[PDB]
Amino acid sequence: TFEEMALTTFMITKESYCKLKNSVSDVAFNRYLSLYNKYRYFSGKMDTAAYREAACSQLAKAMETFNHNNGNDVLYQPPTA
Amino acid sequence: TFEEMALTTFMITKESYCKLKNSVSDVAFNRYLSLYNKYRYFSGKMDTAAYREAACSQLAKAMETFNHNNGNDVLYQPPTASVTT
């Protein structure tokens, strides 16, 4: 699933981007995207439940960039493990 | 392009399906798909514009099947023709 992929390190390619997009509703994707700044600039501790959601944001953001900002592949790594 | 790919033989996979769906507007895709029967049971000779459109409907159909039906990596074969000079 998307939440699960968000926690692993892998390459975002046209193929993997695709499967990830198809695995999450567009509504969920945009909500994750909208939480990016909150986690990119999070002060303090992150309970796992928060880290899971922070990872989804990170992934949604990485996907947005791949798609809306270029034509090239990029390695994805979960937030500060 | 989508039109060009419909005239080639290749495997419809999750990745190829993807590049294909992204290369055509949803509207044009549904249009091609709607013409599948017209060309599938077409009686007679066609000009090149019609042949190209027939190939597109065939590709649109193979993609619909891949996505909505089973979703098993399948080979896409453009339509063959008995050409008359």
Author numbering:
A (entry chain A): 1 to 81
B (entry chain B): 1 to 85
Task: Quote the study on this structure.
The structure covers an 89 amino acid region from T408 to Q496 and is shown to possess a new fold. In particular, the C-terminal hydrophilic region from T408 to Q496 is highly conserved among all the coronaviruses, indicating that nsp4C may play a similar and conserved role in coronavirus replication.
The WT nsp4C monomer contains four α-helices (α1–α4) and two short β-strands (β1–β2). The refined WT model contains two nsp4C molecules in one asymmetric unit, termed A and B respectively. In the WT nsp4C structure, two monomers in one asymmetric unit are linked by a 2.0 Å Cys425-Cys425 disulfide bond to form a dimer. Instead, they are projected in different orientations, with one molecule rotated by about 150° around the y-axis relative to the other molecule. The N-terminal amino acids Cys425, Lys421, Glu422, Lys426, and Asn429 are located in the contact surface between the two monomers. The hydrophobic cavity of WT nsp4C is exposed on the dimer surface, and the C-termini of the two monomers extend in different orientations. We propose that the surface properties of the WT nsp4C dimer are representative of an “open” conformation given that its positive, negative and hydrophobic areas are all exposed.
